[PDB]
Design a protein around this ligand. Sequence first.
Ligand SMILES: Cc1c(CCCO)[nH]c(=O)[nH]c1=O
Ligand SMILES: Cc1c(CCCO)[nH]c(=O)[nH]c1=O
Ligand SMILES: Cc1c(CCCO)[nH]c(=O)[nH]c1=O
Ligand SMILES: Cc1c(CCCO)[nH]c(=O)[nH]c1=O
Lengths: 305, 310, 305, 310
Amino acid sequence: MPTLLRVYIDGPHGMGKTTTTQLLRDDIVYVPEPMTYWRVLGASETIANIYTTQHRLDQGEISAGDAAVVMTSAQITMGMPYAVTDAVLAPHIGGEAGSPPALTLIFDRHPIAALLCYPAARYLMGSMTPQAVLAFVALIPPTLPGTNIVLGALPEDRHIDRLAKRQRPGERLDLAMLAAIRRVYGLLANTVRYLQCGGSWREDWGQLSGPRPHIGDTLFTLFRAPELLAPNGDLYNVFAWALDVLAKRLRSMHVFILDYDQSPAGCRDALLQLTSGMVQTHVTTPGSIPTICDLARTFAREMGE
Amino acid sequence: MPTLLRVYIDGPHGMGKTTTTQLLVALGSRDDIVYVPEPMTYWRVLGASETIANIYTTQHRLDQGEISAGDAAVVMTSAQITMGMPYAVTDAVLAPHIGGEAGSPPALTLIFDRHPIAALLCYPAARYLMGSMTPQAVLAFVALIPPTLPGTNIVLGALPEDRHIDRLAKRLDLAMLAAIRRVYGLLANTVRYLQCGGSWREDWGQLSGPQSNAGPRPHIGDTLFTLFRAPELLAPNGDLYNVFAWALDVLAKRLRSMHVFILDYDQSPAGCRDALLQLTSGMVQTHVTTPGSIPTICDLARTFAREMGE
Amino acid sequence: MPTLLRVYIDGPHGMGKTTTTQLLRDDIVYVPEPMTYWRVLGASETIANIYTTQHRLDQGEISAGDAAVVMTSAQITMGMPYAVTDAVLAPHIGGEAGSPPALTLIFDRHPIAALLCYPAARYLMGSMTPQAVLAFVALIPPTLPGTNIVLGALPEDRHIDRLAKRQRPGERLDLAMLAAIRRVYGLLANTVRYLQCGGSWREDWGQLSGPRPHIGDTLFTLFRAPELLAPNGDLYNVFAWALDVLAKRLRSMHVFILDYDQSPAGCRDALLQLTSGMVQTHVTTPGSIPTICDLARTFAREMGE
Amino acid sequence: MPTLLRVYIDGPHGMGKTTTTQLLVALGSRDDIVYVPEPMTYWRVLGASETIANIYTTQHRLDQGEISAGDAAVVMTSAQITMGMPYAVTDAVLAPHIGGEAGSPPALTLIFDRHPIAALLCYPAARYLMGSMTPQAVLAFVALIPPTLPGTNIVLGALPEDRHIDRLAKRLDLAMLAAIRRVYGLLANTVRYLQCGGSWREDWGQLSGPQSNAGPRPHIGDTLFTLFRAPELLAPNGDLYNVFAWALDVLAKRLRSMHVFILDYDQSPAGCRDALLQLTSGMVQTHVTTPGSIPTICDLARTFAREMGE
Ligand SMILES: Cc1c(CCCO)[nH]c(=O)[nH]c1=O
Ligand SMILES: Cc1c(CCCO)[nH]c(=O)[nH]c1=O
Ligand SMILES: Cc1c(CCCO)[nH]c(=O)[nH]c1=O
Ligand SMILES: Cc1c(CCCO)[nH]c(=O)[nH]c1=O
């Protein structure tokens, strides 16, 4: 059975993933940003709606409840392409191969960006309830073998610079959102590591009110929100179970950090040198490769412009 | 390994589902049958404030022309996320304990008040027909439906519309009642169609202009695939965009391995109970993954019930 | 408190770590190969003794028992510099910093090379008992925070080529040893991953006789050796406890794969791009940096030529 | 948290250590005192074949001039790895359960038949004096001595040489007996020296040409630091190579936080027992890290005893 290498380029937007993936006929396929789905297919100018809603919340034109509704609804549209892609690809993924590959599938983001990271950042911006965030978490697809996710590293000033000259249709340069999104992804990397080193959120939970990251430097800190706790301060079981799922989904992910503070050619090599430690899997059928190729190419043609 | 029987009682609201279930639970030994109730407390307090009231108020507002379709859709989509939360989280923590199928007593019987598809497919689809939700959002929810675990037995209910209207009326939105009844009828036909070898892609062109585990193969027009022939999902060449076509592939995959049964609610509560009890005999059981899965499952259900079912 | 980045360049010898580390005044210090300790200080031509002993075992001049004694004794000498370095450095290492660093300490190998990997490979060459290997494992120092280890990737033919032109004093080009050492390091990488993904050796033990690597692709397979089992096939508790330590020591390590199938400049950049995902720690005293620098420079001056 | 008392009975062999320990264990309740015996079975069968016999045969062979110093050193080094295995593995799995120090009854008392330093320092050092081990290998073992956990109470024994020779003689290598007695005397002085503020680096130059927890500061020449002034460890400038100097730093660090006591074995078994029992009163206890650490520790000790102590 042929081998496959899946690479999910994620992290905060505005550092250069697009460029980095771009600089790069049958052995590698690229599933690009589904901008057409966000701007036309799924709804009308989804990014624009998102930034306009936060801006109005900031100005006091709408309430926090109004914003959260908009924001929750918008995230469903944003993640759609990722969720549908994962669902049809799942059955074709077999078990790990071990320490080249028939096919290399490079994706522009993983489902957790839309189901965990963006929503968590919006929660930090006061435009999304923590219950909605855990509801998206509860819907995160099972982590399949060989789930390699590349997160970016970049000093904030440089990030702002880079983000400013590459704004998306309807986007507004919001420094508070940049900080929130950067904080979530930093916590994300720490969480995977925490979990991989044996961290148990239920055992360390008490430390939030008192060789691995401290629970306070992981995504678990965000869920100490008062909306999720009973009158005695205990976490409701519904949410505690959602955190159990988060732990299980994140733990088996393989995280790779890509330094974006270099030229596009540097990033390109950087990324390519990073693939040697990535985990490959076998496919389930002999005709899985071809199907995967068409899926990816069809996705790109229809949603990546 | 000990065996497990999971039964999800679902279908349109107002038929007597909850009553029936509690009567069934009351018959069995204290610990060989557990109930996972309707998470009303999560819907009224924990996830958000009064969700059902908000859903109904939004629709009414839309009907009166006090808000736009867009305004309603954003509220319905967000409300549906909250509505489905408890079902999704329960399925996610139960998943790992479910083993392979065994055969048609068992160590434990888990009766559930609805299945994830109620909140991720059925209500959203009914709201799409009510004009308070977009077809794109409905398909987004469909794509998020968790993998269907082995031994997924779903009991849907049958009941004459005049009796249902009567039973339900003590708002009483009759248009929504008709829409949810139609959606559940489509659902049963969809499973049947899929189990008889039906391929939506092959029959798609037959579109234009119930029994779940018995009968001949239904026409595609009598299944859920007909709801998605909306102009929003169609490209300039007439066919469905691939994004949406893939969502329909997920829908087929998720519903084809389920075991659906129809329970006639047009009888007394005790009749319903005994009818349901008889139906369990042809249902599929599964093994559990660990020896301590049973206890864990009981605790999960009891915990759920205590915190969210009142 | 200043931050520190420790980088242990390890993996099978002969791929180019030396060159890679070499191509690279106060912010980075290099602790080189302690060749002088191996050839003179600790004993006389230790590498030579090692390869001569295997060769004689292969030719049938000495017995397996004779070889194991020599081999065990030799490994104590080989690891000495690493073990003493770790022991005096331990107290200065604080907790993780999180997602530049005051000091970057690049080492030529980590204690597990001499206490786990080489011995395991020699066990595979029939020149070391499995009990001795688990005895070295039991002596592996506690895994401190920020333990980043770089392992190399390189196709076998290329490795042989590279190994052939860079033989060490007294070394003999042994293809059976190359395979054994390459196999151990491949299993090592799989083991860390297995452990990080929740793998439990005691739970999966039964699979050796019947989203993570299968236990059969980890270092645990090597310890199914008959010398370690009781008459009923059970693992003796002494050894089972040694495997518990292995799991604990390996699990919190951060592994990074460096592709050595490129020019030295490529490897150098490759390695440097790999540092962005490495874990940094705080030191315990304000004067820890300076002390660390002198230790490293003193080590280099006395043992690295 | 429950408290724990760990006592390592060590010192030269042939003084009555084992007997004394078993008498002490026999006094306490069944489960408040557990014994971790000498792992003879690991030394005779499990780790290798007959290790002690091999050690003694090698030395004899060396003495007779039937093998070289190099041949003996390779065998002694490898034998010492096997000898220390069970102590090292036990310390590694016990470590995580040990908490901070409490004060001078406790939930559990663990009596050990020797400590890791016996196999990683004392015997190797004695073999160095016997010419069957190199000083470099001895220092390699020293560098591998595990971090000294809190509440490390070590009981060393005192006994006149004529009585010891008598007690030990039913080979009888008197040179080895003298070497091991000297090493243990040096050890006690080393701890004392370190606890009185002694700095080997400051006093190194005083080298040329017992009581563990009492008395004045011993001279460096009466401590273990004197054994390492060997020509093999000295650079051309006269001083120690840094590699070896760092090994001595590890030795100081490891022995300075230990609590050493001297037990007089020149009395009857019951006298020894009561003497030992009285000594436990000034020993340091520690808390355990988890509430279930006690049971785990008991099982570990019982398992160890069953598998390796006969
Ligand atoms: C992926 C994602 C982005 C990033 C898209 C890149 O510009 N932004 C959002 O507001 N929600 C999402 O979920
Ligand atoms: C499950 C569900 C119901 C049924 C709950 C009332 O019995 N109603 C909705 O409006 N959305 C849903 O998702
Ligand atoms: C590190 C090591 C090497 C590798 C040193 C690099 O040439 N070889 C051995 O035989 N034992 C060891 O432990
Ligand atoms: C502990 C030990 C002993 C003592 C065991 C006999 O009581 N003898 C040796 O030769 N080496 C050792 O390491």
